[PDB]
């Protein structure tokens, strides 16, 4: 592993060169354990007290889990107050 | 010693991540570790009244990790690796106080400027791989003794490759094109002013150019380019620190002018005096930044918390009467930059100008003129901080003070 | 019909005046889910309508819209399956094709006196040429063509007004505006709203056809010095007018920040007096019987934007003797003393 | 920043414009040939 | 197909077009193999215009049986690609199995349209908003029949159009197959325009002709539901199980 | 947000690139960024094990058995290597782990954040799917407001 | 031996098919049932991989064929290359984390998670098939379920973006169908469809160029090549996070898979004809998409055009006729699968917390949600091609494939390296502009009355579990290159002679 | 051949009349595309030393379930050695030419046998060939140094 390098410029070099590679099997092994960690984490952290998607801040206002519950909320609750306003005018407010 | 291991072996990569122990490795390693330990001892109390504490020390330790990996690097792959990681740590340290938006503009400008240098380091190491096929610090030194003597390689490609390879050190050592990231780094902490510059990270470019000087003396025109960029930024770094209201920005431009001195020494071909000036500046202006932050943390009790109040060098006035050991430390630092032979640092600048005047008459007397300007603004900083009345509790000025003294 | 769009344009004031047209539409056919495809600050009027269903935001006068947005809105109107368009955007082909790509039974628009309105008759069942090309400049009514065709005598009466501009507020906007002037020193029955302040703000709710519609501040300082204080609350279009009004007319003078026309009508409904210039607030004051005065820059413009001053018998109209909004500031104080008590 | 605004103008207006205009043209020819 | 009743719209459209494609092979191969150049050119003109215009009118109609009639026009324009190809370079067997698929996935669509009208009474396409919430079975059957008619997953109609475009590409009819593919995408648009309605629903996009659906006031376990689910399975699995159908269709070589 | 009334339009769209933050004239240093907060003497102990178990106990829905198997699952793979090399046994064990976890996650509480936002009207505790198998309470049609008060 | 890839692919569809009615009218039962099925499928993938996938042999492993239709000669050809198993593991992993992130959806979660499993089967069917026509079957079987997800779940103008996506992908998959019709019919004597039999043909240039265009316009919309990329800022930017993290993680990278699978080993000479043009188009793609990103006021569209920008490195590595080029392309496939998946996940969660879409509003939020901030910051660093992360070594091996090309000369290579290296300047501009807009800063009104909830432990496991293989590849890149370098040698054997 | 992007066959560089091939075929460790640089004859002489030391210090790589990386590392470094010996014998001094090319032939047949040993996943033949290839790599390094 010892190589003495002769370069005229600065100094001599004592390069080691430990050529190595994670065994072919060990790459499958680290994939195996990481799929195990993914499995464990999916199960356990799905079984966790998820503090944002439980409260009346999210599930109360809208909160179906989509990305449009805000927009259908602010597009339907004004129609809800227009409906309530018409039903108010139906009894002469 | 070049204790290299293997990193990827699939095809023409055969990549290594080994650790190259030259005397430059020793200089850079002690230059990182001593300054980092002292800045951490400082930062135990600098951050002691900060809600952001542990993520600062995570950024500090990961920066020290990255910079020690940068200086122990056997190939341009790993230099590139830890180079960009140092740039990321610069982004994180400057945008540490993330809630203030001027630090947000500062850290964005900083990381973008470091990526403009990263750009050049990339197409500079790829150009060296096209000219050599090396990706190692070992074989470049024994190929560039006879690579320019060949007919396939172009001299134009080698000089533009070396200039793009120098674009990186422009962004790290805050040289004249890519210098606008350095004085905005003040909005983060004062330890990152002592560590991002006057230390490790602006020594990354100095380390890179001095490590690649066996392939910078060979390409003929790049040495003049490095001399030119240094001699342009020493007049910029001097004239900028003449009229700064901020203590930290003024010491930043002082750091930038001394880094221009280092690049002017690297443009001399001076393998020895450049590194020695790097050592004495990186131990001098680091002391100057810690003294400045002690001034700042003393002024926090007066003015409350504000950088236009507690970092404004104008209304610091005089602190010799109040904080004496800070005065002595800051004075020994500013005499270490002003060039006092017996009890300060002068032999570095002596070797700079001695190697300068026998080189080219254009670059020499303007370097001595900037040295006089450097002594001028550093003594201006010392007088505005420590010598005179306080400028803030002064009974001519503060009306609340006249209301408070006369009960 | 059962589903009917409205591709109205202009902003607060033009879309406000369209409320008798919408009430005419729901009076014409019994159950209609009316929609609105208006510009921004047009949706904000449609709390005050109790008739309609969606009331989107489109800015129809954009004339080079985002093609994603343009294609999305064409497909949205196709997916709502209308029967009648009722544009009053005042454009021809290019926009007549926009109304034509909607699967609509009754394509109705307004049409330029100029050329950019040719080839539109091919794609519209009603043409409705208009005047001035500045359609808000025609005045209050603005839709007599569309009012007279929607509900022609075919089975019964047109019924073209139903006590025009019956806007209506809800309890939520009433409570939040009640808190907004209760932060000021006003009592819920006894105050006077203004909504006339010289500013550079799009919450001024003026018109498209009126230029010098908003009264100054030192002229307003003369008006507010000449008048006795019945707690005049001041309705700024933007927060940079607050310190400016407190510099001109005083610190004791209460300032209520309102940019929403629904909030503005809620502030009308608790007031007892209205000193509005030619903004939405005159029409909101005539809604729900509040005594207005209705400042203007011209007697003729005041007749175009109020043809019904003789009808409500409270909105005693005042205009400038010349143009340029410089009136007497004296007799308007006199009939402000007359009608407000 | 000006180059970014010019480039998103070229994107959203006149290469997303062509793709959206294919469907706009199909809607238009469908509405015309329905009523011809 | 507006005022004429939906069962005879189904029966007459499907039976008329299968017997007309029967005659369109029969009186066009045996007494017209000499003028086959102008014959193929006339069928190519009518086929390309039919594929374009049926699928390009059927986008923009608020009715349900009218745009189904135009989709039937477009699918018969797909059948004419199998008419133009001979017995040899991709036979009429593709045309046969696509007619089998066409019957199977079109009678299910019309079974669902009949059930929307034996329970509501209307045929307006905008009344479909909210069928998934009221009746997931009928919504699933109609959505799956429409996706069979369009052909996105491996259903029957996708493999029928694939066998058609295969035989047309093997015969060299490039400008038939490419136009058939573009109009297949154009069919996919108005099919998923329908499937927007019978899946979604937002409590006022639903119609009062939809909200009172009343599946329970019904006669019995009907045979409409039985034939409908037979057509749904015959729109799903014979695309998967096509090899016996092609194996029983390729043996029709006596058409001459 | 909620916006029961229609919101005020921003008359000043501050900039297409710069942030929505206040400027340096109104930025009180130290008390905003936290750079000069943390005056200690008010913080508490629970050092690194009285605050890990505090956090694990803060966010957890697991009983004694499930959770013990979860804590012993990953060491059962970390001992799958370095102690043996069983092969398929790890995968079959983790498969049965996931199957028994999913069977355990057919929990007795049903937790109305697991339900539709159309369920949220009032008195939803009297709704009891937690005990009633094959509920047949036709309310999920979601097209008209049902009084399920029985 | 065993029907491996068949029971891989058919298991999410056939196991999600047990949600027929299943009377449990919350999201709990079908939620946990589908995460159970996705974990079982991931363990099936790993068990087929660690124990019956030889990482040395550059040939068709887990080979399997059935009979489907005798007339098409259409089989059920299944088999994995070295270029395929990275994408299969990326598929299983990212889609399992997608249905993990898809827990709090509760609108119609039965049909939602069923179409999640339908995508989770159809994608592995696309990557695993050794057939052209079955690749097309699965190329359009991945279309209607993600349509039904896109349109009924997530996004403001999600209807427009959903119809634009389904029409755009259908109107390009018809060109894919033209390509497979051309190769199968007019490929050679004995018309076949097995890719084991088909990658060894003559294909003269006037026919191979037409085949290559018929597949390049097909794959150019799916790996978004800048003449055809209009579908993506709508499709990704107007979807919610759990569907978009598989739309960007694995659905964006097929096609780029097909440019390696179909357009590189089936059609080598016309790929050598047009890869000079694809190289220039990828270099314009990186700069173009990195410059359209600061023009986006929207948050999620910046990440969409960021994905378009990082696909340029894949197009360049495919067009770089080299082992480092193609191997960096496969590495950028897996790396940016993780990167785009995690960024669109965190953008969806940031919209769920802050409820603000654009970036003129939504100022300093990092004091409000520091966990989302630190994960989004570190994943922005992963997007920056910044080291210790897989995007760094991906783009650097793409650069190394440029600089070691036998196809190109120095006149081209200097321009290509220069234009590509401007892209790693433009990428910090929009990424740090996003960071300084939505996180850095301070709003005076936001002090205590809101007090937003931070990242919960589920979403934090999502972000960490995507972050860990990015780091593990960014420090040891042979987690990708070693499983494919043999196959890339077998590819480039056809190019270098 | 329009400057940028020479196109079509994508050739590998040839052999300049040397007997450095196998003669029953060219060679079995030829990596297809690698960038050996035109540095110069002393540069090729040094890179022979460098890659010969690489295959020398391939010690810690050889082991069970690692033979494929041994084969890839061998093909890579031996392709570098192959082009560098081709340039060295192509620029030889006409008396150093024949013994150094015989040395290269008896080195490359040793590389062929080691590549076949590591290709068939047989560790005993791998080590039994690696012994005298370590001898010959030390021999070629002390020749080039
Ligand atoms: C093939 C032509 C596309 C025709 C169908 C059509 O006009 O597109 C329909 C679609 C918009 O129409 P939709 O009715 O889907 O509109 C969205 C609405 O559902 C809600 O806004 O337009 C685009 O997405 C452009 C498609 C580019 C397709 C390439
Ligand atoms: C090998 C390379 C792999 C790793 C590369 C490292 C990636 C960069 C780290 C960037 C984290 C910055 C993101 C960041 O600044 O987050 C800031 C976030 C906020 O923490 P504070 O304690 O400031 O939060 C309380 C505040 O509300 C009051 O200031 O702190 C973190 O979560 C600490 C994590 C730093 C861990 C490092």
UniProtKB/TrEMBL annotation, chain A:
The chain holds residues 65 to 157 of 161 of the full protein. One of its GO terms (biological process) is photosynthetic electron transport in photosystem I. It comes from Arabidopsis thaliana (Mouse-ear cress). The chain crosses the membrane at residues 30-48, 68-84. One of its GO terms (cellular component) is NAD(P)H dehydrogenase complex (plastoquinone). The gene is PNSB4. The keyword Ribonucleoprotein does not apply. This is NDH dependent flow 6. Keywords: Membrane, Transmembrane, Transmembrane helix. Signal peptide: none annotated.
Automatic annotation (TrEMBL), chain E:
It comes from the Eukaryota. Its main location: membrane. GO terms for cellular component: chloroplast thylakoid membrane. The keyword Cell membrane does not apply. It is a multi-pass membrane protein. Keywords: Chloroplast, Membrane, NAD, NADP, Plastid, Plastoquinone, Quinone, Thylakoid, Translocase, Transmembrane, Transmembrane helix, Transport. It is found in: Membrane; Plastid, Chloroplast thylakoid membrane. Residues 1-187 form the NADH:quinone oxidoreductase/Mrp antiporter transmembrane domain. One of its GO terms (biological process) is ATP synthesis coupled electron transport. It catalyses: a plastoquinone + NADPH + (n+1) H(+)(in) = a plastoquinol + NADP(+) + n H(+)(out); a plastoquinone + NADH + (n+1) H(+)(in) = a plastoquinol + NAD(+) + n H(+)(out). NDH is composed of at least 16 different subunits, 5 of which are encoded in the nucleus. Belongs to the complex I subunit 2 family. This is NAD(P)H-quinone oxidoreductase subunit 2, chloroplastic. The chain holds residues 257 to 512 of 512 of the full protein.
From TrEMBL, chain G:
Residues 129-413 form the NADH:quinone oxidoreductase/Mrp antiporter transmembrane domain. It catalyses: a plastoquinone + NADPH + (n+1) H(+)(in) = a plastoquinol + NADP(+) + n H(+)(out); a plastoquinone + NADH + (n+1) H(+)(in) = a plastoquinol + NAD(+) + n H(+)(out). GO terms for molecular function: NADH dehydrogenase (ubiquinone) activity; oxidoreductase activity, acting on NAD(P)H, quinone or similar compound as acceptor; quinone binding. The lineage of its organism: Eukaryota, Viridiplantae, Streptophyta, Embryophyta, Tracheophyta. Its EC number is 7.1.1.-. This is NAD(P)H-quinone oxidoreductase chain 4, chloroplastic. Belongs to the complex I subunit 4 family. It is a multi-pass membrane protein. Keywords: Chloroplast, Membrane, NAD, NADP, Plastid, Plastoquinone, Quinone, Thylakoid, Translocase, Transmembrane, Transmembrane helix. It comes from Arabidopsis thaliana. One of its GO terms (cellular component) is chloroplast thylakoid membrane. The chain crosses the membrane at residues 4-22, 34-54, 74-103, 110-127, 133-153, 165-189, 209-232, 244-262, 274-291, 303-322, 328-351, 372-402, 414-439, 460-477. It is found in: Plastid, Chloroplast thylakoid membrane. One of its GO terms (biological process) is ATP synthesis coupled electron transport. InterPro entries: NADH_Q_OxRdtase_chain4 (IPR022997), NADH_Q_OxRdtase_chainM/4 (IPR010227), NADH_UbQ_OxRdtase (IPR003918), ND/Mrp_TM (IPR001750). PANTHER family: NAD(P)H-QUINONE OXIDOREDUCTASE CHAIN 4, CHLOROPLASTIC (PTHR43507:SF21), NADH-UBIQUINONE OXIDOREDUCTASE CHAIN 4 (PTHR43507). Its main location: plastid.
């Amino acid at each position: 592993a010892v190589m003495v390098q002769q370069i005229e410029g600065m100094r001599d070099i004592i390069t080691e060169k430990h050529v190595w590679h994670l065994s072919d099997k060990a790459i499958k092994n680290v994939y195996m354990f990481y799929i195990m960690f993914t499995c464990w984490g999916c199960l356990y952290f799905g079984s966790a007290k998820d503090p944002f998607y439980d409260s009346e801040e999210y599930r109360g206002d809208g909160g179906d889990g989509t990305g449009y519950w805000v927009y259908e909320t602010v597009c339907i609750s004004p129609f809800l107050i227009l409906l309530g306003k018409k039903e108010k005018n139906l009894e002469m407010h | 010693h070049q204790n290299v291991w293997s990193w990827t072996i699939n095809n023409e990569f055969s990549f290594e991540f080994g650790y190259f122990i030259d005397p430059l490795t020793s200089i850079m390693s002690i230059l990182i570790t001593t300054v980092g330990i002292l800045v951490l001892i400082y930062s135990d109390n600098y951050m002691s009244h900060d809600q952001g504490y542990l993520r600062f020390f995570a950024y500090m330790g990961f920066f020290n990790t990255s910079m020690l990996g940068l200086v122990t690097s056997s190939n341009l792959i790993q230099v590139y690796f830890f180079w960009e990681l140092v740039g990321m740590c610069s982004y994180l340290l400057i945008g540490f106080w993330f809630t203030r938006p001027i630090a947000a503009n500062a850290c964005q400008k900083a990381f973008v400027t470091n990526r403009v240098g990263d750009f050049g380091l990339l197409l500079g190491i790829l150009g060296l791989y096209w000219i050599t096929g090396s990706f190692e610090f070992q074989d470049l030194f024994e190929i560039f003794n006879n690579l320019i003597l060949n007919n396939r390689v172009n001299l134009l490609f080698l000089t533009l490759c070396a200039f793009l390879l120098f674009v990186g050190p422009i962004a790290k050592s805050a040289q004249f094109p890519l210098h606008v990231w350095l004085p905005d780094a003040m909005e983060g902490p004062t330890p990152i002013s002592a560590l991002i510059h006057a230390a490790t990270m602006v020594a990354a470019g100095i380390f890179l150019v001095a490590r690649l000087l066996p392939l910078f003396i060979v390409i003929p025109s790049i040495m003049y380019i490095i001399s030119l960029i240094g001699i342009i930024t020493v007049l910029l770094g001097a004239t900028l620190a003449l009229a700064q209201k901020d203590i930290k920005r003024g010491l930043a431009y002082s750091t930038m002018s001394q880094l221009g001195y280092m690049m002017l020494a690297l443009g001399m071909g001076s393998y020895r005096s450049a590194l020695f000036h790097l050592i004495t500046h990186a131990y001098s202006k680091a002391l100057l930044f810690l003294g400045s932050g002690s001034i700042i943390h003393s002024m926090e009790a007066i003015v409350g918390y504000s950088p236009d109040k507690s970092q404004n060098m104008i209304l610091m006035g005089g602190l010799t009467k109040h904080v004496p050991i800070t005065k002595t430390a800051f004075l020994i630092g500013t005499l270490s930059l002003c060039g006092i032979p017996p009890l300060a640092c002068f032999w570095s600048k002596d070797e700079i100008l001695n190697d300068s005047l026998l080189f080219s008459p254009i670059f020499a007397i303007i370097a001595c003129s900037t040295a006089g300007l450097t002594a001028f603004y550093m003594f201006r900083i010392y007088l505005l901080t420590f010598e005179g009345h306080l400028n803030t509790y002064f009974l001519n000025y503060s009306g609340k003070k006249s209301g408070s003294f006369y009960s | 019909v059962r589903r009917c769009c409205c591709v109205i344009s202009g902003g607060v004031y033009e879309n406000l005046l369209f409320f008798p047209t919408i009430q005419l539409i729901k009076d014409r056919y019994p159950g209609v889910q009316v929609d609105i495809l208006t510009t921004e600050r047009g949706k904000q009027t449609y709390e005050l309508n109790k008739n309609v269903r969606w009331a989107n935001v489109y800015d129809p006068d954009d004339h080079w819209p985002e093609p994603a947005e343009y294609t999305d809105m064409i497909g949205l109107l196709k997916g709502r399956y209308y029967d009648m368009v009722l544009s009053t955007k005042l454009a021809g082909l290019g926009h007549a094709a926009f109304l034509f790509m909607t699967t609509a039974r009754d394509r109705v628009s307004y049409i330029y006196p100029n050329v950019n309105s040719a080839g539109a008759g091919l794609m519209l069942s009603e043409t409705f040429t208009a005047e001035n090309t500045n359609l808000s400049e025609l005045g209050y009514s603005m839709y007599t063509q569309m009012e007279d065709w929607l509900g022609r005598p075919f089975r019964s009466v047109p019924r073209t007004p139903l006590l025009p501009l019956r806007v209506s507020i809800s309890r939520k906007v009433k409570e939040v505006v009640a808190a907004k002037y209760r932060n000021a020193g006003a009592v819920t029955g006894k105050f006077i709203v203004i909504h006339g302040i010289e500013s550079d703000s799009k919450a001024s709710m003026q018109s498209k056809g009126d230029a010098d519609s908003l009264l100054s501040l030192e002229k307003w300082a003369k008006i507010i010095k000449g008048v006795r204080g019945f707690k005049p609350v001041f309705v700024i279009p933007h927060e940079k007018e607050r310190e400016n009004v407190e510099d001109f007319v005083g610190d004791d003078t209460s300032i209520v920040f309102i940019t929403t026309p629904g909030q503005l009508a809620a502030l009308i409904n608790d007031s007892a007096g209205v000193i509005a210039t030619n903004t939405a607030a005159i029409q909101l004051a005539n809604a729900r019987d509040k005594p207005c005065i209705g400042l203007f820059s011209s007697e003729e413009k005041g007749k175009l934007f109020v043809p019904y001053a003789e009808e409500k018998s409270n909105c005693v109209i005042i205009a400038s003797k010349t143009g340029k909004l410089a009136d007497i500031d004296i007799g308007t104080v006199k009939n402000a003393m007359q009608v407000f008590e | 920043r000006r180059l970014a605004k010019q480039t998103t103008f070229f994107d959203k207006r006149i290469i997303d414009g062509i793709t959206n205009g294919v469907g706009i043209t199909s809607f238009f020819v469908g509405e015309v040939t329905k009523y011809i | 197909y507006e005022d004429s009743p939906t069962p005879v719209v189904a029966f007459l459209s499907v039976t008329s077009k299968v017997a007309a494609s029967a005659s369109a092979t029969r009186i066009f191969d045996i007494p017209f193999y000499f003028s086959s150049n102008e014959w193929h050119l006339l069928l190519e003109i009518l086929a390309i215009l039919s594929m374009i215009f049926g699928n390009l009118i059927a986008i923009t109609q608020t009715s349900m049986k009218r745009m189904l009639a135009y989709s039937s026009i477009g699918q018969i324009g797909y059948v004419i690609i199998g008419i133009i190809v001979g017995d040899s370079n991709g036979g009429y067997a593709s045309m046969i199995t696509y007619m089998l698929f066409y019957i199977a996935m079109n009678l299910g669509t019309f079974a669902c349209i009949i059930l929307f009208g034996l329970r509501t009474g209307t045929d307006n396409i905008r009344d479909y908003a909210g069928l998934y919430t009221k009746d997931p079975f009928l919504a699933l059957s109609l959505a799956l029949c429409l996706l069979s008619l369009g052909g996105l997953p491996p259903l029957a109609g996708f493999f029928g159009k694939l066998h058609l475009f295969w035989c047309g590409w093997q015969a060299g009819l490039y400008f038939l197959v490419s136009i058939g593919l573009l109009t297949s995408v154009l069919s996919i648009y108005y099919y998923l325009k329908i499937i927007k309605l019978l899946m979604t629903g937002r409590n006022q996009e639903i119609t009062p002709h939809m909200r009172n659906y009343r599946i329970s006031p019904l006669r019995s376990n009907n045979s409409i539901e039985l034939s409908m689910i037979v057509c749904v399975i015959a729109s799903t699995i014979p695309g998967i199980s096509m090899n016996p159908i092609i194996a029983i269709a390729q043996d029709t070589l006596f058409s001459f | 947000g909620l916006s029961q009334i229609e919101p005020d339009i921003n008359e000043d769209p501050i900039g297409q690139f710069e942030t929505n933050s206040i400027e340096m004239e109104d930025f009180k240093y130290g008390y905003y960024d936290g750079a000069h907060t943390y005056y200690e003497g008010e913080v508490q102990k629970g050092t690194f094990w009285g605050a890990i178990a505090d956090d694990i106990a803060a966010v957890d829905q697991t009983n004694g058995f499930q959770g013990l198997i979860s804590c012993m699952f990953l060491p059962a793979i970390a001992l799958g290597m370095y102690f043996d090399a069983p092969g398929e046994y790890l995968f079959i064990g983790a498969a049965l782990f996931t199957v028994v976890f999913c069977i355990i996650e057919m929990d007795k509480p049903d937790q109305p954040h697991n339900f539709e936002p159309q369920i949220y009207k009032l008195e939803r505790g009297a709704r009891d799917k937690l005990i009633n198998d094959y509920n047949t309470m036709s309310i999920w049609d979601f097209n008209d407001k049902y009084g399920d008060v029985w | 031996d065993f029907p491996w890839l068949t029971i891989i692919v058919v298991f999410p569809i056939s196991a999600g098919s047990l949600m027929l009615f299943l009377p449990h009218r919350g999201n709990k039962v079908n939620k946990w049932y589908t995460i159970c099925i996705c974990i079982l499928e991931l363990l099936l993938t790993t068990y087929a991989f660690c124990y019956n996938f030889k990482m040395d042999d550059p040939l068709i492993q887990l080979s399997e064929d059935y009979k489907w239709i005798d007339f098409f000669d259409f089989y059920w050809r299944m088999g994995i290359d070295g270029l395929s198993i990275g994408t299969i593991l990326l598929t299983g992993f990212i889609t399992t984390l997608a249905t993990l992130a898809a827990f709090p959806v509760t609108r119609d979660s039965r049909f939602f998670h069923f179409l999640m499993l339908a995508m989770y089967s159809g994608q592995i069917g696309s990557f695993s098939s050794r057939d052209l026509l079955l690749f097309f079957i699965m190329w359009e079987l991945e279309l209607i379920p993600v349509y039904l997800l896109l349109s009924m779940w997530g996004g403001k103008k999600r209807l427009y973006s959903a119809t634009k996506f389904i029409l755009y992908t259908a109107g390009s998959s018809i060109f894919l169908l033209i390509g497979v019709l051309g190769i199968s019919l007019y490929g050679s004597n004995e018309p076949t469809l097995n890719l084991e039999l088909l990658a060894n043909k003559s294909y003269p240039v006037t026919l191979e160029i037409l085949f290559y265009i018929g597949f390049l316009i097909a794959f150019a919309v799916k790996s978004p090549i800048i003449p055809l990329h209009t579908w993506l800022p709508d499709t990704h930017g107007e979807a919610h996070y759990s569907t978009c993290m598989l739309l960007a993680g694995i659905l964006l990278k097929m096609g780029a898979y097909g440019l390696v699978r179909i357009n590189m080993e089936l059609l080598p000479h016309a790929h050598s004809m047009f890869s000079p043009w694809l190289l220039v188009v990828g270099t314009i793609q990186i700069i173009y998409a990195a410059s359209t990103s600061p023009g986006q006021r929207n948050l999620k569209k910046r990440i969409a055009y960021s994905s378009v920008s990082h696909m340029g490195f894949i197009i360049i590595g495919i067009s770089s006729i080299t082992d480092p080029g193609l191997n960096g392309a496969i590495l950028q496939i897996i790396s940016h699968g993780f990167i785009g998946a995690a960024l669109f996940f965190l953008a969806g969660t940031s919209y769920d917390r802050i409820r603000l879409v654009y970036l003129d509003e939504m100022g300093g939020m990092a004091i409000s949600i520091p966990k989302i901030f630190t994960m989004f910051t570190i994943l922005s660093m992963a997007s920056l091609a910044l080291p210790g992360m897989s995007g760094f070594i991906a783009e650097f091996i793409v650069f190394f494939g440029i600089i070691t090309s036998q196809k190109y000369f120095l006149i081209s290579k200097i321009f290509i390296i220069f234009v590509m290296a401007i892209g790693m300047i433009l990428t910090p501009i929009y990424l740090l502009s996003m960071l300084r807009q939505m996180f850095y800063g301070y709003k005076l009104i936001n002090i205590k009355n809101f007090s937003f909830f931070d990242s919960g432990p589920r979403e934090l496991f999502l972000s960490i579990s995507i972050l860990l293989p990015i780091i593990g590849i960014g420090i040891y890149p042979d987690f990708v290159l070693s499983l494919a370098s043999d196959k890339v040698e077998s590819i480039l054997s056809n190019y270098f002679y | 051949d329009n400057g940028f992007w020479i196109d079509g066959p994508l050739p590998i560089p040839p052999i300049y009349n040397n007997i450095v091939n196998e003669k029953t075929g060219t060679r079995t460790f030829i990596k297809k595309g690698v960038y050996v640089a035109d540095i110069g004859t002393k540069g090729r002489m040094y890179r022979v030393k460098k890659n010969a030391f690489d295959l020398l210090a391939m010690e810690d790589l050889i082991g069970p379930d690692t033979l494929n990386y041994v084969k890839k590392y061998l093909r890579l470094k031996s392709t570098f050695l192959f082009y560098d010996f081709d340039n060295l014998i192509s620029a030889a001094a006409s008396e150093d030419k024949q013994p150094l090319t015989d040395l290269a032939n008896r080195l490359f047949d040793n590389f062929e046998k080691l590549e076949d040993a590591a290709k068939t996943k047989n560790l005993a033949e791998t080590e039994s060939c690696y012994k005298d290839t370590k001898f010959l790599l030390q021999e070629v390094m002390t020749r080039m140094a």
